Amino acid sequence: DPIADMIDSLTALQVLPTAANTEASSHRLGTGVVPALQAA
Amino acid sequence: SDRVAQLTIGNSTITTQEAANIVIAYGEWPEYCPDTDATAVDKPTRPDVSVNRFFTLDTKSWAKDSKGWYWKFPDVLTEVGVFGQNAQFHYLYRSGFCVHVQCNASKFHQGALLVAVLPEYVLGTIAGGTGNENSHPPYATTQPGQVGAVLTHPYVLDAGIPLSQLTVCPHQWINLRTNNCATIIVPYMNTVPFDSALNHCNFGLLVIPVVPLDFNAGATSEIPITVTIAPMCAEFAGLRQAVKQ
């Protein structure tokens, strides 16, 4: 071929019959990991 | 030799030498709430010694014309000890109980008490006598605290239900010729896994003399009745400032 430029979704579904479970968690102290600060 | 018993929980011990068995109400021991039955997501607190211990209330006096007494649970302990502080600082509470009622007399006295546990003991009134008033019991009657209240019409248990079939509930007798104590272990019974300790009472304890007290003149006429109770698997959740009522 003499002309080279003529050669040339994010999410998916899932079945969720029930609401989400809650896991057990403990305390957390440290730097760098801040899940509460957001950017709206 | 099963007439002797010892109940040790926390830093407290009760000994008795004249006893019947221990009644476990509906064949179930008290337990903590499992993960399948729980709904609230925050972690609960379990103090496990400072709240699971024997608590002794005030003492009644059995006379020859006594009608009977009742207490409300856990309203008796909402101002007592570390249990009364956890019940005010938290929104939800869950626990079972071990109730122990003491009454001793000599071998020349006679009488019989019925000690019963009735869950959701809702009280009624006499409706003004004639039945035309829609009266309601006061707050000191429905939740009398650690002192307790007296029954006005014990034959209908102040609720329109007869005393004669109160033994369909978990119960013991204190027959003065046979034993001097009664012990019932009560699990947590509700339609919800946790509830409020200031708004809701799970059960009521009723102590009614079915056979009246009798003795001859010269014997001891001061026959007292003492109630000693212990929470068993006390849990608390929903921490916030202290609310008394």
Q: How far apart are CA B4 and CA B16, in angstroms?
A: 6
* B204 closest CA partner among B13, B72, B48: B72
Residues near B106 by Cβ (< 8 Å), separated by ≥ 6?
B215, B219, B220
- Token duo for residue A35: 């899940």
Residues near B212 by Cβ (< 8 Å), separated by ≥ 6?
B64, B65, B66, B111
CA A23 to chain centre: 19
* B134 closest CA partner among B143, B125, B142: B125
Omega before residue B74 within 30° of 0, cis: yes
* B62 closest CA partner among B98, B97, B101: B101
Torsion sign over Cα B77, B80, B83, B89 = positive
Residue that has been written with the tokens 């400032």 in this structure: B241
Q: What is the domain count for chain B? A: 1
CB B55 within 8 A of CB B229: yes
Per DSSP, A23 falls in state -
What's the domain range around B199? 1-245
Q: How far apart are CA B20 and CA B180, in angstroms?
A: 9
CB B88 within 8 A of CB B235: no
User: Secondary structure of chain A: what % helix, strand, coil (to 5)?
Assistant: 10, 0, 90
CATH code where residue B208 lies: 2.60.120.20
- Got the DSSP string for chain B? --S-EEEEETTEEEEESS----EEGGG----PPPTTT----SPPB---SSSSS-EEEEEEEE-TT---EEEEETGGGTTSHHHHHHHHHEEEEE--EEEEEE----TT-EEEEEEEEEES------TTTTS-S-----HHHH--TTT-EE-S-TTTTTTT--GGGGGGSSEEEEETTT-SEEEEEE----SSSSB-TTT---EEEEEEEEEEEE--BTB---EEEEEEEEESS-EEEEE-S----
- Token duo for residue B48: 């496990």
